[PDB]
């Protein structure tokens, strides 16, 4: 490009070509889980009366 | 002496030579045309003026 248009181009390039920044991303998933089941019942049959 | 004094003279009145110097920076097609707007600097079609 023209003589002016490479200073801007040359500012241009120098901003775009900046150091870029590094992250470093640390993700903490926690999950916890549990329950209760209970299953209790009682059943009674006799041969005379009945059952259950 | 005289006559050839008149001719050399009419010679080196109406000069007409380029000069290159070096531009570094803004852009020499805006330099044409922010000066070709200098109308009248060579650019005319001046009759009895002879602008051309």
Same mark, same amino acid.
């Given at each position: 490009?023209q003589p002016?248009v490479?200073?801007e181009? !040359?500012? &241009? &390039?120098?901003?775009?070509?900046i150091r870029?920044?590094? &992250?470093? &991303? !640390?993700a903490?998933?926690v !999950?916890?889980?549990?329950g209760?089941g209970?299953?209790?019942?009682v059943?009674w049959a006799?041969?005379?009366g009945?059952?259950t | 002496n005289?006559?050839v004094?008149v001719v ?9 030579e380029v ?13 044409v ?10 650019n005319?079609?001046?009759g ?5």
């Open positions: 490009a002016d490479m200073a181009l !040359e500012q &241009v &390039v120098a901003k775009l070509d870029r920044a590094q &992250v470093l &991303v !640390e903490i998933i !999950e916890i889980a549990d209760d209970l299953n209790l019942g059943q006799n041969t005379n009945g059952g | 005289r006559l004094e050399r003279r009419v010679d080196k009145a109406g000069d007409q000069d290159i110097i070096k531009l570094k920076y803004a852009s020499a097609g805006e330099m045309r922010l000066v070709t707007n200098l109308n009248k600097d060579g005319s079609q001046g009895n003026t002879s602008l051309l």
